[PDB]
Write a protein that binds this ligand. Sequence first.
Ligand SMILES: COc1ccc(CNC(=O)c2ccccc2C[N@@H+](C)Cc2ccc3c(c2C(=O)O)OCO3)cc1
Ligand SMILES: COc1ccc(CNC(=O)c2ccccc2C[N@@H+](C)Cc2ccc3c(c2C(=O)O)OCO3)cc1
Lengths: 149, 149
Amino acid sequence: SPGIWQLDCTHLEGKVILVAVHVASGYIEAEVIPAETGQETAYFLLKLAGRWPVKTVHTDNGSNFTSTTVKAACWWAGIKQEDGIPYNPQSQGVIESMNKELKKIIGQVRDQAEHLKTAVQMAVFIHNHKRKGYSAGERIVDIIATDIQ
Amino acid sequence: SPGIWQLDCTHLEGKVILVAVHVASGYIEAEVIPAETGQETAYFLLKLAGRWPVKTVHTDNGSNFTSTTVKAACWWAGIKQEDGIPYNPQSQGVIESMNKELKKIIGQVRDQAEHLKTAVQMAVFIHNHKRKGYSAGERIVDIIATDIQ
Ligand SMILES: COc1ccc(CNC(=O)c2ccccc2C[N@@H+](C)Cc2ccc3c(c2C(=O)O)OCO3)cc1
Ligand SMILES: COc1ccc(CNC(=O)c2ccccc2C[N@@H+](C)Cc2ccc3c(c2C(=O)O)OCO3)cc1
């Protein structure tokens, strides 16, 4: 559970926003890409696993689940690739809610930058730092530090 | 000191590798960019601070120290920008050694990908996961969790 992440893809300004959510904490990393391809998703997971102890990724769709490039990156990085089927139905809504909150934040910062990617990183910052009294950034560090010891 | 990071720029294949080192743990994030500009450096720090509690950044040179874009990103992200002057004479050496180690890893994985950026991220992965017996990834999480509590 300290190592379980969910991939999420959303669309804005004709571009794709790829998100990895740390399930237990609600912490996120995100990138803007022109279109979701296996190569991009693979590259994004490699980056993520080099930064956090990623044991399991719940993939966002069947194209990424099938992708030979995505499977190669997961093998390289020691990641168990899983489907993202919400056997828990309170997961579909939780992601939808996160895309909504994310997009709200991006709207709140959008004028602060020309490039969508800049506004997306600002939104990642504001999301991870928001106290709800611990923030996502706090929760992920505590969850994982507890696991290490 | 849980929040202190050092910027480092190194060169390979006619490109720039931008590195942020978490001073206490030796954990790193890195990116490939065409050339170090204030805008790229600013963007890299924004990404970094949204992912980890960055209190202080020791900038890698006087151009980034002066950069009005870099100062604007630091202000936005709550980052104290400082010089990277190695008042401890053993800071020049640690960085030199890290660039050497990094470039060595990149050499050990280089054939595993066409794009330098892919090899750099593999190298980041291998660096952060190496047991030294705790890894850099383990140390940074330990250091910061101890601070949160
Ligand atoms: C990240 O540091 C920041 C430092 C300062 C600001 C303040 N806002 C403005 O000055 C501004 C506002 C609106 C439109 C254009 C601009 C001018 N640009 C240069 C901002 C910028 C810088 C670095 C980047 C960017 C962009 C971008 O516009 O997307 O894209 C990737 O690296 C934002 C971000
Ligand atoms: C991260 O997932 C990986 C999955 C598999 C491999 C195995 N190695 C090869 O198949 C290979 C080896 C040498 C040359 C070209 C290739 C073919 N490409 C498509 C690998 C690749 C994929 C995604 C990317 C890349 C690149 C790249 O070549 O740099 O750049 C940004 O996103 C590496 C990385």
